């Protein structure tokens, strides 16, 4: 699927940038992660959590463009 | 001495039931609160609670009970028969103690 010819966008090094830092505080999140026994969570667990749509839209969005 | 030393007493035990207190700390909890219901007198009341997220009686008495020697098997066998689950809500457990 390359939908003919549009306004076709170009790589953008600010584009890069922003991905790559967006993957390094992702890997940061993942690393401020306590994993506690049975079902108790700490009550960082939630806003950690939170962020997760954010980092995902942004990925799927650097895919599809 | 235990007699000698301070006055009848009205406790109530408030044990955390967590995710985090699983395990070795659950056998600690369990052996602190039969000693320390050891140290009760006939002239003392006792009632043990606990609390994961929503507190509730471990044992069948719901207000208080008078230390005999009968109701404090009781509250020694319910503690003995916990769990641990769930997580830590403070301000309901001290509401309900
Ligand atoms: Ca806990």
Redesign the interface.
Known sequence: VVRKYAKKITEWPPFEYMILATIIANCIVLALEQHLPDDDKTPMSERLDDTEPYFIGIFCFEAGI | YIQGAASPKDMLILVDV???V??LTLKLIRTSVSEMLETLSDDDFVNVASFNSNAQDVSCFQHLVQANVRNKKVLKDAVNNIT?????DYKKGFSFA
């Open positions: 967590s995710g985090s699983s395990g641990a689950k769930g997580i830590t």
